[PDB]
């Protein structure tokens, strides 16, 4: 760095899509019909119902 960056340069990084995708992003989920925990589709739990039929 050759100079102190003002609040605008600090604020410029949040307009970027990289920032938004990394930090402020909401996850999509449903309720596991076997466990009733919030769940992302494609990720399962160690429980013998959830291994064979993985809901």
Partner 1 sequence: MYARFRTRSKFYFRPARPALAYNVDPNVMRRPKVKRGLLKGTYSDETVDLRDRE
Partner 2 sequence: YQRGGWSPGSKHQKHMTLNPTLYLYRFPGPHGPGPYTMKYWWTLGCFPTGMEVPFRLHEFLSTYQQEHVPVEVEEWLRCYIKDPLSELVNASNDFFKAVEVYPEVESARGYKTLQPSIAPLLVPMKKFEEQLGVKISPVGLRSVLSNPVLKDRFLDDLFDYKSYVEKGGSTPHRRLARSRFAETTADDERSLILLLTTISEGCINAGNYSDAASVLADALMFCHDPDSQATTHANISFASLLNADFKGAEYNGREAALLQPQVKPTSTACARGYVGWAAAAAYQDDFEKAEAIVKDGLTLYVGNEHLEKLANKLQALRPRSLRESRSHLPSQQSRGLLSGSGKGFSNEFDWVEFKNKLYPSKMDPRNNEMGSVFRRVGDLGSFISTSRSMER
Partner 3 sequence: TPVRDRKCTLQYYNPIRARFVYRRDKPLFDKYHVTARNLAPGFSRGALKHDWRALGVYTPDHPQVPYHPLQTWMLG
Partner RNA sequence: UAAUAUUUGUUUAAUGAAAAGUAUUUUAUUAUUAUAUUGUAUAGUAUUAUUAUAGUGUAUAGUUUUUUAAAAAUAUAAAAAAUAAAGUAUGAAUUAAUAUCAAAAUUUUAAUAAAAAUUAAAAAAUU
Partner RNA sequence: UAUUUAAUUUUUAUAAUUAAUAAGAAAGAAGAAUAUAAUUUA
Binding residues: 32, 35, 45, 50
* Residue 15 structure tokens: 């307009």
**Among residues 2, 3, 21, 43, the one that binds partner 1 under rule CB under 8 A:** 21
Query: Is residue 2 a contact point for RNA (CB under 7 A)?
Result: yes
Q: How many amino acids of this chain bind partner 3 (CB under 8 A)?
A: 9
Query: What's the min distance (Å) between Cβ of 41 and partner 3?
Result: 7
* Residue 52 structure tokens: 């064979």
User: 42 in the Ramachandran plot: left (φ > 0), alpha (ψ -120 to 50) or beta?
Assistant: left
Query: Is residue 40 a contact point for partner 1 (CB under 8 A)?
Result: no
Spell out the long-range contacts of 39-45 with Cβ–Cβ below 8 A and sequence spacing 24 or more: none
């Amino acid at each position: 760095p050759k100079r102190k960056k003002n609040p605008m340069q600090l604020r410029r990084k949040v307009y970027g899509l990289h920032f938004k995708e990394k930090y402020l992003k909401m996850e999509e989920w449903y309720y596991c019909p076997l466990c009733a925990e919030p769940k992302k589709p494609g990720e399962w739990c160690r429980r013998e119902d959830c291994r064979q039929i993985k809901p």
